[PDB]
Design a protein around this ligand. Structure first.
Ligand SMILES: *[C@@H]1O[C@H](CO)[C@@H](O[C@@H]2O[C@H](CO)[C@@H](O)[C@H](O)[C@H]2NC(C)=O)[C@H](O)[C@H]1NC(C)=O
Ligand SMILES: *[C@@H]1O[C@H](CO)[C@@H](O[C@@H]2O[C@H](CO)[C@@H](O)[C@H](O)[C@H]2NC(C)=O)[C@H](O)[C@H]1NC(C)=O
Ligand SMILES: *[C@@H]1O[C@H](CO)[C@@H](O[C@@H]2O[C@H](CO)[C@@H](O)[C@H](O)[C@H]2NC(C)=O)[C@H](O)[C@H]1NC(C)=O
Ligand SMILES: *[C@@H]1O[C@H](CO)[C@@H](O[C@@H]2O[C@H](CO)[C@@H](O)[C@H](O)[C@H]2NC(C)=O)[C@H](O)[C@H]1NC(C)=O
Ligand SMILES: *[C@@H]1O[C@H](CO)[C@@H](O[C@@H]2O[C@H](CO)[C@@H](O)[C@H](O)[C@H]2NC(C)=O)[C@H](O)[C@H]1NC(C)=O
Ligand SMILES: *[C@@H]1O[C@H](CO)[C@@H](O[C@@H]2O[C@H](CO)[C@@H](O)[C@H](O)[C@H]2NC(C)=O)[C@H](O)[C@H]1NC(C)=O
Ligand SMILES: *[C@@H]1O[C@H](CO)[C@@H](O[C@@H]2O[C@H](CO)[C@@H](O)[C@H](O)[C@H]2NC(C)=O)[C@H](O)[C@H]1NC(C)=O
Ligand SMILES: *[C@@H]1O[C@H](CO)[C@@H](O)[C@H](O)[C@H]1NC(C)=O
Ligand SMILES: *[C@@H]1O[C@H](CO)[C@@H](O)[C@H](O)[C@H]1NC(C)=O
Ligand SMILES: *[C@@H]1O[C@H](CO)[C@@H](O)[C@H](O)[C@H]1NC(C)=O
Ligand SMILES: *[C@@H]1O[C@H](CO)[C@@H](O)[C@H](O)[C@H]1NC(C)=O
Ligand SMILES: *[C@@H]1O[C@H](CO)[C@@H](O)[C@H](O)[C@H]1NC(C)=O
Ligand SMILES: *[C@@H]1O[C@H](CO)[C@@H](O)[C@H](O)[C@H]1NC(C)=O
Ligand SMILES: *[C@@H]1O[C@H](CO)[C@@H](O)[C@H](O)[C@H]1NC(C)=O
Ligand SMILES: *[C@@H]1O[C@H](CO)[C@@H](O)[C@H](O)[C@H]1NC(C)=O
Ligand SMILES: *[C@@H]1O[C@H](CO)[C@@H](O)[C@H](O)[C@H]1NC(C)=O
Lengths: 262, 146, 617, 49, 49
């Protein structure tokens, strides 16, 4: 969120009466940025908040062999993240600019993910269409092979082999991590727009100076109104560029959130 | 007021200020419509996809044609859009039973052809997975392997 | 006294018609729920307009008096209304100090130079204002301590008078055989018009924490939710200007105390350099007799800056000090010392009889009184060539037409004023090309901490809170900047300590409302403001400070989202804050040989709405 | 092309069905554009399409 | 791609020095056009490869 008056004018009060003479440009900026701010929380709810109840796994945590400890939460942590989630988060104020916090904390998101994991491992896909119906996991895997055209005895006669091979295959995932460039790019693109927006305040745009107080200190009002009006136009153009790009870039992350929710 | 209290060489300067301001505002207006126009088009493409896949067919895609198991959908028109009426199948009133992956008989392993083996406490039956309807375990609804 | 208005003093801001249009206007009104004085009389102030209500079936109020002096010798306004009709009049009056058969009108006794004439229970309201020489009156008479309701007032007159007003009085009908006074302030309202074009309701903006809203949405009905309406900005106090010390005074103390001055014909010349110059030694130094400053004023010697400060000193006779000045003549100023016509220096001159006045004649100080032609400004001539006035060359022998060019004063203590030796010093500045040089001395200002202040550190101008730092500058660096090149630390010139700088503490202000159809209670969130810097129920969240809602330990479904897991609801009424509930808690009875199978089902029907088109423009 | 004591504009003048207050000269639709005036001489409200 | 200097000034030293008073507008212009030019090769790899 950008404070239009503090970005353009900046502290000065003689400027505020001049900025009012350009109409509702500062109202448009606030409305446009609020639209983005509301959609970004909805994007997250649609991807993760697809479960009614918060499911938990049973204490034993032994599902016919298959070992899921690398994707289930670690009870010996303040954050209750999984071992793989701990790796995933280890790789990625100014002149009127502020950053608002998300509505959902990352603890709350972790609770949606653990509910999806606990629902699936114990009831497969039945809880997404109604009540959760328990079935042993080994039998869940056998139905899944049947869905791809493999006869179900292939699992039941080879249950140990598939469970042991799976456990190593999932174990290799950490080695490939210890990738997330698509997540760092989102951070970089916004950091670059905020670093550029601030740097554009040190530009004269063809005026005598770039500071709205220094103009007055060494110039009469009749001519100072012209010099300040040039700087206002230049910095107002900066805000229009910034907000237009945030709308175009927010449509791209929204399309990605729709794919992730799907 | 600009063409009445200024000479021509002085009024041109003031007209350019109005043209610049009003042109900037009008050019902003049209750019914002291009940005919104891409969004309504994307929504219309989703509505067209659901029209084929939810109304002219039966979809298996999860949470694409309502919540539950898709049976059928009916369209209704709206002023600037479309309303879909989605009819879904939802199971209710479950009970627990006991299961086994296979049955041993004559030293051989029997598997269900299209169901699950269940036990009501004393006898074993075969049911279909989405509706409780027990059948006697026979050689007509099972197959042998191993 | 002070009565509590409710929604009173609302008048039609102008002509123009308007149907169903929640119009927003800025003008001079009586604020809603204001403190209005009560009278049952003395001259009252005006300052900016007046609200005037009253109650009574009879007519006790018999006009008003306005103006600047409320007396004669200047024109004033007088408004009366007998049983006929209102009479506006603007003359020069002479008012009774107590103005009031059935004979009346003992208010004034003079009506000169009239510039305007005109002739032609119960609540009688008036609004008076005076803008650009126009004196407006709104009024309405509505039949029934004042009651409670809304009624907009229509224009009554339009009076191109020109009159200034700063005070006014009232007139009452005595017994021989109750009124209100408010004032107007610049406020903003949101006015509701009916289909007939009249004002039926209004919202005072900049008042309650709520209304601060009705003005942002342009409505009188707000739907449940959370609205960003304004912002919080901490303000700085005090202005501290820090600076260095002095290093060197640049000792005037000698040039103005030299025990052996110089005779005028060969006058000494001391040039100041880059220094600290404190002329407060002088202006408030000795007793002095003459101190005249030509280029700059004697007090502004300590806020300018010049390159080279030349200082001349000598001694001369009493009545000749009138010749050390731009553009003079005489045996001394002609050719001993010539000041130019565009002088910028500062002349000081005093009496020194007791210090350079010895008995029996003190023949040390000479003064030339023969020369070919007059001198050049600031030039110097010390020769001793024998003069030649006649036509025969001298060959360096005194006598006839060959005079020695140097004489000597005397100065015995028994002289009158105008012949005792005076000491004269002159200062002269000149700024050739130097970037900066010796300037005046700097007035410090202490240095406070942990407070938002307006600071200046020897040229560095800014605003913010000063705190002890943990950075280490290099032993030549004054201040530091952050990435993006903004100053974030300075060094105090006097104490040589590094201090961090941080802006005040602004942020948005949002209003949390259950909906005007539920309640008029509200809570306010100051976004990322610490709860110690805001200026009951104060709740600290990662999103700021929430005031006006109670935080409970239960967990509900989210209703109004605040942020960082916190929501608000209208349940327990009042307004509360809390942490959202994601959902219930289900524990599936999992085992390695148990299955659940449905025995029944239901057919469910849901809808989904999707936009397909927009308007073609 | 009309001018009503200062109000300058262009449009078609037609008999209206609005009722001004007895101090109002004209008015402005939503978005604040003049859409009706009163004739100073005859005191009748006219719409300005 | 467009070279901002050639478009705006076109081999003119008086104009080229004046471009220094506007800050980093050309930096934004080059990155905006380059960032979408790289995606165009990605678009064809994802369809055929
Ligand atoms: C699930 O896998 C984890 C490893 O990913 C197992 O935990 C490790 O077990 C080995 C011995 O087999 C120990 O040397 C490691 O110290 C264990 N790691 C940790 C973090 O404790 C775990 O035992 C497996 N679970 C089951 C039921 O086999
Ligand atoms: C499991 O289901 C079977 C079939 O319904 C039950 O066995 C029958 O029970 C009925 C009475 O409900 C008797 O009339 C039949 O003779 C029974 N059949 C046989 C082959 O014995 C059985 O009782 C059920 N088990 C439980 C624990 O309810
Ligand atoms: C100019 O010189 C005089 C005398 O040389 C200084 O006066 C002295 O005054 C102080 C204050 O009363 C005494 O304590 C000293 O004893 C005096 N000096 C002597 C030698 O007795 C005077 O201070 C000098 N001017 C300045 C500005 O310092
Ligand atoms: C500037 O002058 C002040 C005095 O006005 C100096 O303050 C002294 O600082 C030292 C430590 O550096 C202390 O021991 C002294 O007691 C201080 N004097 C007083 C009167 O408080 C300060 O050091 C000077 N600054 C510089 C850079 O020389
Ligand atoms: C399936 O059977 C289980 C027990 O084997 C039932 O789960 C228990 O239900 C009681 C309440 O009736 C709870 O107090 C226990 O804590 C439950 N146990 C566990 C492990 O969660 C369950 O209700 C049965 N399901 C159905 C659909 O009848
Ligand atoms: C399956 O559930 C439905 C209800 O969803 C049962 O039908 C209801 O039966 C009760 C009792 O006879 C009636 O009062 C209701 O009117 C019925 N509802 C409807 C919508 O018809 C039905 O009996 C259940 N089936 C079985 C086999 O138990
Ligand atoms: C302005 O003057 C005209 C006349 O020039 C007035 O017109 C009269 O209007 C009344 C009705 O209001 C009629 O009964 C008269 O017959 C009209 N006179 C003529 C000569 O046509 C008009 O009323 C005046 N306007 C105002 C506001 O006084
Ligand atoms: C009027 O307002 C003052 C504060 O300005 C308050 O102290 C006083 O009680 C008010 N008077 C009434 C009658 O409400
Ligand atoms: C009413 O007062 C005015 C002003 O004093 C005066 O001119 C007028 O004659 C009065 N009318 C009567 C009937 O006295
Ligand atoms: C009114 O009287 C004042 C002197 O009191 C005088 O200056 C002024 O000119 C007079 N006005 C007229 C219109 O005669
Ligand atoms: C009213 O008084 C002000 C000074 O307070 C003065 O400048 C102004 O000219 C006066 N107005 C008139 C109409 O005399
Ligand atoms: C005034 O408004 C009322 C509704 O509040 C309406 O019934 C009435 O007709 C209006 N009067 C006129 C003259 O239009
Ligand atoms: C809103 O007000 C109407 C009456 O005007 C009432 O019937 C309705 O219940 C109210 N809604 C709420 C949520 O209180
Ligand atoms: C507010 O400031 C105090 C110190 O004055 C500090 O203890 C507290 O943690 C601060 N609150 C926040 C939210 O930073
Ligand atoms: C909430 O519970 C905590 C302990 O978990 C307690 O310290 C706190 O006082 C409680 N808050 C309220 C409002 O009762
Ligand atoms: C069944 O689960 C129990 C734990 O509940 C476990 O001890 C046992 O080994 C499992 N049986 C088989 C055949 O996997």
């Amino acid at each position: 969120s950008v404070d239009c008056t503090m970005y353009i004018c900046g502290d000065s009060t003689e400027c505020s009466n001049l900025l009012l003479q350009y109409g509702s440009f500062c109202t448009q900026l606030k409305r446009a940025l609020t639209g983005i701010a509301v959609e970004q929380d909805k994007n997250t709810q649609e991807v993760f908040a697809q479960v009614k109840q918060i499911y938990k796994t049973p204490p034993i945590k032994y599902f016919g062999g298959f070992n899921f400890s690398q994707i289930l939460p670690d009870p010996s942590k303040p954050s209750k993240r999984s071992p793989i989630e701990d790796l995933l988060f280890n790789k990625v104020k100014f002149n009127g600019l502020t950053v608002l916090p998300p509505l959902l904390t990352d603890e709350m998101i972790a609770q949606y993910t653990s509910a999806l994991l606990a629902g699936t491992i114990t009831s497969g896909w039945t809880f997404g269409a109604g009540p959760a119906l328990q079935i042993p996991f080994p039998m869940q895997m056998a139905y899944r092979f049947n869905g791809i055209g493999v006869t179900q005895n292939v699992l039941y006669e080879n249950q140990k082999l598939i469970a042991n091979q799976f456990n190593s295959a999932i174990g290799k995932i950490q080695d490939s991590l210890s990738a997330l460039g698509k997540l760092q790019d989102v951070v970089n693109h916004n950091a670059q727009a905020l670093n550029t927006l601030v740097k554009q305040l040190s530009s004269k745009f063809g005026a005598i100076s770039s500071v709205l107080n220094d103009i007055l200190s060494r110039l009469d009002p009749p001519e100072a109104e012209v010099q300040i009006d040039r700087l206002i136009t230049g910095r107002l153009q900066s805000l229009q560029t910034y907000v237009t790009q945030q709308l175009i870039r927010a449509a791209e992350i929204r399309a990605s959130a729709n794919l992730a929710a799907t | 007021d600009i063409l009445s209290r200024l000479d021509p060489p002085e009024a041109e300067v003031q007209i350019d200020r109005l043209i610049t301001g009003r042109l900037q505002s009008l050019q902003t207006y049209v750019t914002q419509q291009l940005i919104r126009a891409a969004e309504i088009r994307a929504s219309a493409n989703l509505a067209a996809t659901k029209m084929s896949e939810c109304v002219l067919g039966q979809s298996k895609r999860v949470d694409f044609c309502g919540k539950g198991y898709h049976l059928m959908s009916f369209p209704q028109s709206a002023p600037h859009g479309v309303v879909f009426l989605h009819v879904t199948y939802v199971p209710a009133q479950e009970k627990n039973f006991t299961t086994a992956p296979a049955i041993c008989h004559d030293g051989k392993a029997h598997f269900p052809r299209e169901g699950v083996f269940v036990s009501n406490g004393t006898h074993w039956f075969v049911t279909q997975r989405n509706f409780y309807e027990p059948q006697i375990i026979t050689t007509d609804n099972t197959f042998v392997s191993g | 006294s002070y009565t509590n208005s409710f929604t009173r003093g609302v008048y039609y801001p102008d002509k123009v018609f308007r149907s169903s249009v929640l119009h927003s206007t800025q003008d001079l009104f009586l604020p809603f729920f204001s403190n209005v004085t009560w009278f049952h009389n003395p001259v009252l102030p005006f300052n900016d307009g007046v609200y005037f209500a009253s109650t009574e079936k009879s007519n006790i109020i018999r006009g008003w008096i306005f103006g600047t002096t409320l007396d004669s010798k200047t024109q004033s306004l007088l408004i009366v209304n007998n049983a006929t009709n209102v009479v506006i009049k603007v003359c020069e009056f002479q008012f009774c100090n107590d103005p009031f058969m059935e004979s009346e009108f003992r208010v004034y006794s003079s009506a000169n130079n009239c510039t305007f004439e005109y002739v032609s229970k119960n609540l009688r309201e008036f609004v008076f204002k005076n803008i650009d020489g126009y004196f407006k009156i709104y009024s309405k008479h509505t039949p029934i301590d004042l009651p409670q309701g809304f009624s907009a007032l229509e224009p009554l007159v339009d009076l191109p008078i020109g009159i200034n007003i700063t005070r006014f009085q009232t007139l009452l009908a005595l017994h021989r055989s109750a009124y209100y006074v408010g004032y107007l302030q610049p406020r903003t309202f949101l006015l509701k018009y009916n289909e007939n074009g009249t004002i039926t309701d209004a919202v005072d903006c900049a008042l309650d924490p709520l209304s601060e809203t009705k003005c942002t949405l342009k409505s009188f009905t707000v739907e449940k939710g959370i609205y960003q309406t304004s912002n919080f900005r901490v303000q700085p106090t005090e202005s501290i200007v820090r600076f260095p010390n002095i290093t060197n005074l640049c000792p005037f103390d000698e040039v103005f105390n030299a025990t052996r001055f110089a005779s005028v014909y060969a006058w000494n010349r001391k040039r100041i350099s880059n220094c600290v110059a404190d002329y407060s030694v002088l202006y408030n130094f000795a007793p002095f007799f003459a101190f005249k400053c030509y280029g700059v004023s004697p007090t502004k010697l300590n806020d300018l800056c010049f390159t080279n400060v030349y200082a001349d000193s000598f001694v001369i006779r009493g009545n000749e000090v009138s010749q050390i000045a731009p553009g003079q003549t005489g045996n001394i100023a002609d050719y001993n010392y010539k000041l130019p016509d565009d002088f910028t220096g500062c002349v000081i001159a005093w009496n020194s009889n007791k210090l350079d006045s010895k008995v029996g004649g003190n023949y040390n100080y000479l003064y030339r009184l023969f020369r070919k032609s007059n001198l050049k400004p600031f030039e110097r001539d010390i020769s001793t060539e024998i003069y030649q006035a006649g036509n025969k060359p001298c060959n360096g022998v005194a006598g006839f037409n060959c005079y020695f060019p140097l004489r000597s004063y005397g100065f015995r203590p028994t002289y009158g004023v105008g012949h005792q030796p005076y000491r004269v010093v002159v200062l002269s500045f000149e700024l050739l090309h130097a970037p900066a040089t010796v300037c005046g001395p700097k007035k410090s200002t202490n240095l406070v901490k942990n407070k938002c202040v307006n600071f200046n550190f020897n040229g560095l101008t800014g605003t913010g809170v000063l705190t002890e730092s943990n950075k280490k500058f290099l032993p030549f660096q004054q201040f530091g900047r952050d990435i993006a090149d903004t100053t974030d630390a300075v060094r105090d010139p006097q104490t040589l300590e590094i201090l961090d700088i941080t802006p005040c503490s602004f942020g948005g202000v949002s209003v949390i409302t259950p909906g005007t159809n539920t309640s008029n209670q509200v809570a306010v969130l100051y976004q990322g403001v610490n709860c110690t810097e805001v200026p009951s129920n104060v709740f600290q969240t990662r999103a700021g400070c929430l005031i006006g809602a109670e935080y409970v330990n239960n967990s509900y479904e989210c209703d109004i989202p605040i942020g960082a897991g916190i929501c608000a609801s209208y349940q327990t009424q009042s307004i509360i804050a809390y942490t959202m509930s994601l959902g219930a808690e289900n524990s599936v009875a999992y085992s390695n040989n148990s299955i659940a199978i449905p025995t029944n089902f239901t057919i469910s029907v849901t809808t989904e709405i999707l936009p397909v088109s927009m308007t073609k423009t």
